[PDB]
Motif scaffolding. Sequence first.
Motif, PDB file in Angstrom:
ATOM      1  N   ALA A 114      68.781  35.309  41.569  1.00  0.00           N
ATOM      2  CA  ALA A 114      68.294  36.150  42.645  1.00  0.00           C
ATOM      3  C   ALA A 114      69.329  36.269  43.745  1.00  0.00           C
ATOM      4  N   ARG A 117      73.639  36.303  41.702  1.00  0.00           N
ATOM      5  CA  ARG A 117      73.908  37.440  40.822  1.00  0.00           C
ATOM      6  C   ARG A 117      73.171  38.674  41.297  1.00  0.00           C
ATOM      7  N   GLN A 118      72.286  38.500  42.275  1.00  0.00           N
ATOM      8  CA  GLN A 118      71.518  39.621  42.815  1.00  0.00           C
ATOM      9  C   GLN A 118      70.867  40.451  41.715  1.00  0.00           C
ATOM     10  N   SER A 119      70.279  39.790  40.726  1.00  0.00           N
ATOM     11  CA  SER A 119      69.668  40.507  39.610  1.00  0.00           C
ATOM     12  C   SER A 119      68.466  41.310  40.085  1.00  0.00           C
ATOM     13  N   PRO A 120      68.420  42.608  39.734  1.00  0.00           N
ATOM     14  CA  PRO A 120      67.287  43.458  40.118  1.00  0.00           C
ATOM     15  C   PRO A 120      65.970  42.900  39.607  1.00  0.00           C
ATOM     16  N   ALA A 121      66.041  42.133  38.521  1.00  0.00           N
ATOM     17  CA  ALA A 121      64.869  41.575  37.851  1.00  0.00           C
ATOM     18  C   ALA A 121      64.400  40.234  38.432  1.00  0.00           C
ATOM     19  N   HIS A 122      65.105  39.717  39.434  1.00  0.00           N
ATOM     20  CA  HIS A 122      64.718  38.449  40.057  1.00  0.00           C
ATOM     21  C   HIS A 122      64.611  38.586  41.578  1.00  0.00           C
ATOM     22  N   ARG A 123      63.571  39.279  42.037  1.00  0.00           N
ATOM     23  CA  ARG A 123      63.384  39.572  43.456  1.00  0.00           C
ATOM     24  C   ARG A 123      62.097  38.956  44.060  1.00  0.00           C
TER      25      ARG A 123
END
Length: 207
Positions: A114, A117-123
């Motif tokens: 989150a 990696r700033q994953s769009p899927a982990h917000r």
Amino acid sequence: MLQILGKPTSINVRKVLWTCAELGLAFEREDWGAGFRPTNVPEFLALNPNAMVPVIRDGDFVLWESNSIIRYLAGRYGGEWLYPADARERARCDQWIDWQASELNRSWSYAFLALVRQSPAHRDAQQIEASRANWAKHMAIVEGQLQRTGAFIAGDAFSLADIPIALSINRWLETPIARDDLPAVDAYMTRLASRDAYREYCRNGTP
């Protein structure tokens, strides 16, 4: 010449690179992994059906799973000084190596994905905090162990177990989270600064 397949920013590849440097091995590294060269292609899957890095090729011998790799390299390349053959001494190393991969690594998953990696899927804020909290509990175990040894994770001497553990600590320190003060942890990371390969592959700015 030993071949290391994996991008140099991967924590698990860095375990392997650090181990190579410590042991005194020559190697060639190829970039593989997200953001570098995709691994979900037949030529890579043939080497590792997980499509993950690191993978090594040592002559005709192909091996994956980072902790397994570093054990292999220490066993094969005169690393008895780093990974002692005596069962009890080796066990002291293994406990931390195995725990790093099975509990510590697992704990940081959501927060790291989150926040770093700033994953769009982990917000999900709740899951970020849940992961940070659990991670912190594991870091408190690391702290107690280092208070006990006053030296390295497994005892008086630098060992194979310090490679997964210090890289993990580096990840904790480089993730943008609020962290409790852990003075044994800090003193350990300061102690390791004397090792060239720690500076190169561990505390080098990369989470």
